Write a protein that binds this DNA or RNA. Structure first.
Ligand SMILES: [Mg+2]
Ligand SMILES: [Mg+2]
Ligand SMILES: [Mg+2]
Ligand SMILES: [Mg+2]
Ligand SMILES: [Mg+2]
Ligand SMILES: [Mg+2]
Ligand SMILES: [Mg+2]
Ligand SMILES: [Mg+2]
Ligand SMILES: [Mg+2]
Ligand SMILES: [Mg+2]
Ligand SMILES: [Mg+2]
Ligand SMILES: [Mg+2]
Ligand SMILES: [Mg+2]
Ligand SMILES: [Mg+2]
Ligand SMILES: [Mg+2]
Ligand SMILES: [Mg+2]
Ligand SMILES: [Mg+2]
Ligand SMILES: [Mg+2]
Ligand SMILES: [Mg+2]
Ligand SMILES: [Mg+2]
Ligand SMILES: [Mg+2]
Ligand SMILES: [Mg+2]
Ligand SMILES: [Mg+2]
Ligand SMILES: [Mg+2]
Ligand SMILES: [Mg+2]
Ligand SMILES: [Mg+2]
Ligand SMILES: [Mg+2]
Ligand SMILES: [Zn+2]
Lengths: 122, 120, 86, 203, 50
RNA sequence: CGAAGGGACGGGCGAUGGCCUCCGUUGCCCUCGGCCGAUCGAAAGGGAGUCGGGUUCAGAUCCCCGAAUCCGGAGUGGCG
RNA sequence: CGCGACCUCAGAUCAGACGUGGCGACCCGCUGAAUUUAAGCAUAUUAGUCAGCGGAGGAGAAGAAACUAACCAGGAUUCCCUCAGUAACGGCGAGUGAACAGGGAAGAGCCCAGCGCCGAAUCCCCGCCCCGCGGCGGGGCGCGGGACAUGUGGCGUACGG
């Protein structure tokens, strides 16, 4: 009876949170038995429910995030967690488009005097 | 004239301060309420002085999170146990976490609530 | 008397735990830390103590962020990609 | 062009036309704070032959520097040991006043790049300079070659590493028989090269 | 003292949870090299910095 | 060596959302203005208002029982 | 006793950005001793070194002569070998101390302001229709704002134009 994260990614949030909050009820009932002695079969199943809550919330936080990557798909300003992360120094450098900008005087010596190709015989 | 300075002091005049209207939210989503009702109450106490207070004093006793106040505890017991609360007394133990003495209404009694929870 | 009978009058803390670097060197009346220098922005560090620099340098902690950057460096700091699903 | 007449008029600083302007401005500049943005260059020709254009992202700051020498920061004049270092008063600082005017402009404006600076009138007590600052993240500068070299991270705080026009003149670097002190790039690089003992594999 | 601040009370709470003996089942693991608690503190002999 | 008050029932011009009869708000205009110095600083100084009995292996002016009290809120009035 | 134009300043939780701090082996800018040696010691020496302060980068700094040279001349900068423990400095005591040429490692050059002509020819922003994202750009527009004649862009830099 193991829930798996790829079995969950088609089901919407009106039935993920219903499937989520009764796992949290199930986790709270197990910690009741943890302090009343309980049973060793019901103490090993704490980790099975703690990771079941972590797996449902992962699918929720990933269905939500990709729906905001696509709501802002092609907008002038995106939130700071949706624009890329890479490195602070890499976010300050010039981009692909303005590193290869050249002045009109620079791109006239490129076309009048191009670097030729030449062999020299002996 | 007809403007008149009836004070020896030049004060800075007030200007138009207008509210923000940003082109984008700085955070994409509001952050999830990670201290919810199931994160308030962690586990009850079943000690020999806790069962002695369920009988004579008509009150439950839980181990709550250290971040919670007496209003969140009174609402979390009211939600996920379907019982009404008179008052809540709290202390932080030398273990580190916070003990909550939640007292029920005189309608209910904690002896047939602890049967449903299963701590008895 | 300067010996034993004057140690009994010691009941007043001079230093306490600091918010930055956590050592018990935050002076209460001077409002400063004797270890990291905190009321201030810049961290206290001196070159006349080589041993005291290898006790709070980068690496002696967790490096919660730099151990990920050292991993993400090996793939060109790639971002927004999914490892070719089945 | 009318920039050739302004260039010759500022070479007449003792003329009765030009000593009047250099006193009414020095009065005006004395009544303001030591860090003060000018809305435009006071010398529009001297600024532009040092790299100023009338575009967006080039700003001007007016810096007020106390003139005089460098009194040694020692308590009650007692510099201990060996009377050659007993000098307290008649000491001179290694960088010029224009080099410490550029440095106070760029330390307050950390998000800007110090390009260069010029002179706008002294005092007996003060000395006034105007510094040319560049905003390295405006799109009027980063979308332009021949000026986007300063938008590179190697040019951050170039007034503090001593690589502006006034900060470099106090380094002693140049071509010649006079500048043998800095004949490896700097005075420290030349010192480190002629004080390493080269120990080869085969002696 | 009975008058204490919350972040020193939380300091004292940590250093009595780790004033604890070693578990009985630690000493049967593969590659043990640990037999007691080498950093265990008594309130009378060795005091706390705080 | 500072243009250091972003506040004020009221007055009112009203854009006007409505139990639009109004009536809680709202922005600006006219009107009035120094806690004149951010802030920190006392578990012995200043500082509203809790006491009696009972109760535990260890807690109580804090928990029970019984008597009070202070502060704040009451627009839809809670009645005299 | 208003309405405007500008100029000089100011306020804002205004729209969008940017700087701070760490590390610091190397690099740059300052600041800067004394022990030591001189068989004492003060100039000198240690040493422009230690400690102190600031700023970086994957290198940095330097760099296309206001140069070396006096030759039948060389031709940016950095590094190595040599010059050379030399020229020189020094209570001419102790001590200190380069550079040129030559041989190599690499090898690369260029851009302004000014002076001038060219109906500002130039740039920034915000909407817009069309194509991509994955460091967000081009193409067109808008009798749409703004910067700008207190000088933007093109040609052009001492090797001449
Ligand atoms: Mg050109
Ligand atoms: Mg309490
Ligand atoms: Mg810090
Ligand atoms: Mg001085
Ligand atoms: Mg000496
Ligand atoms: Mg110096
Ligand atoms: Mg003792
Ligand atoms: Mg100790
Ligand atoms: Mg006032
Ligand atoms: Mg106080
Ligand atoms: Mg008090
Ligand atoms: Mg008191
Ligand atoms: Mg007692
Ligand atoms: Mg804003
Ligand atoms: Mg001696
Ligand atoms: Mg001797
Ligand atoms: Mg002696
Ligand atoms: Mg010296
Ligand atoms: Mg040092
Ligand atoms: Mg820094
Ligand atoms: Mg870096
Ligand atoms: Mg290099
Ligand atoms: Mg460089
Ligand atoms: Mg030249
Ligand atoms: Mg020889
Ligand atoms: Mg020397
Ligand atoms: Mg021109
Ligand atoms: Zn500290």
């Amino acid at each position: 009876a193991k829930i798996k994260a790829r079995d969950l990614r088609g089901k919407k949030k009106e039935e993920l949170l219903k499937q989520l909050d009764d796992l949290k009820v199930e986790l709270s009932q197990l910690r009741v038995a943890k302090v009343t002695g309980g049973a060793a079969s019901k103490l090993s199943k704490i980790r099975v429910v703690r990771k079941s809550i972590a797996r449902v919330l992962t699918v929720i936080n990933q269905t939500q995030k990709e729906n905001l990557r696509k709501f802002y798909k092609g907008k002038k300003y995106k939130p700071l967690d949706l624009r890329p992360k890479k490195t602070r120094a890499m976010r300050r450098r010039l981009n692909k488009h303005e590193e290869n900008l050249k002045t009109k005087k620079q791109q006239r010596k490129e076309r009048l005097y191009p670097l030729r190709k030449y062999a020299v015989k002996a | 004239k007809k403007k008149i300075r009836t004070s020896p002091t030049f004060r800075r005049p007030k200007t138009l301060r207008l509210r923000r209207q940003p082109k984008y939210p700085r955070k994409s989503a509001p952050r999830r309420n990670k201290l919810d009702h199931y994160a308030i109450i962690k586990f009850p106490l079943t000690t020999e002085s806790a069962m002695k207070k369920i009988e004579d004093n008509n009150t439950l006793v839980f181990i709550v999170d250290v971040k919670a106040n007496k209003h969140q505890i009174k609402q979390a017991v009211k939600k996920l146990y379907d019982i009404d609360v008179a008052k809540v007394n709290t202390l932080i133990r030398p273990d580190g976490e916070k003990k909550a003495y939640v007292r029920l209404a005189p309608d209910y009694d904690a002896l047939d609530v602890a049967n449903k929870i299963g701590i008895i | 008397t300067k010996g034993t009978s004057s140690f009994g009058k010691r009941r007043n803390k001079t230093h306490t735990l600091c918010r930055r670097c956590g050592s018990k060197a935050y002076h209460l009346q001077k409002s400063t830390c004797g270890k990291c220098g905190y009321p201030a922005k810049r961290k206290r560090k001196y070159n006349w103590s080589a041993k005291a620099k290898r006790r709070n340098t980068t690496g002696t902690g967790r490096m919660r962020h730099l151990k990920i950057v050292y991993r993400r460096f090996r793939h060109g700091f790639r971002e927004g990609t999914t490892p070719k699903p089945k | 062009g009318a920039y050739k007449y302004i260039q010759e008029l500022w070479r007449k600083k003792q003329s009765d036309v030009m000593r009047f302007l250099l006193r009414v401005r020095c009065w005006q500049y004395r009544q303001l704070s030591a860090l003060h943005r000018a809305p435009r260059p006071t010398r529009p020709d001297k600024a532009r032959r040092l790299g100023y254009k009338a575009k967006q992202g080039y700003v001007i700051y007016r810096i007020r520097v106390r003139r005089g020498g460098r009194k040694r920061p020692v308590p009650k004049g007692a510099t201990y040991g060996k009377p050659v270092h007993h000098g307290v008063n008649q000491l001179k600082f290694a960088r010029s006043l224009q080099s410490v005017a550029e440095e106070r402009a760029g330390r307050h404006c950390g998000a800007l790049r110090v390009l260069n600076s010029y002179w706008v009138g002294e005092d007996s007590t003060y000395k006034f300079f105007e510094v040319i600052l560049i905003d390295p993240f405006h799109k009027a500068i980063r979308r332009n070659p021949d000026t986007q070299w300063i938008t590179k991270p190697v040019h951050k705080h170039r007034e503090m590493r001593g690589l502006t026009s006034a900060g470099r003149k106090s380094r002693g670097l140049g071509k010649g028989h006079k500048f043998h002190h800095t004949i490896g790039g700097s005075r420290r690089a030349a010192w480190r090269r002629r004080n390493t003992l080269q120990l080869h594999r085969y002696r | 003292s009975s008058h204490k601040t919350f972040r020193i009370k939380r300091f004292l709470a940590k250093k009595q949870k780790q004033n604890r003996p070693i578990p009985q089942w630690i000493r049967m693991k593969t590659g043990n090299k640990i037999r007691y608690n080498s950093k265990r503190r008594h309130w009378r002999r060795t005091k706390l910095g705080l």
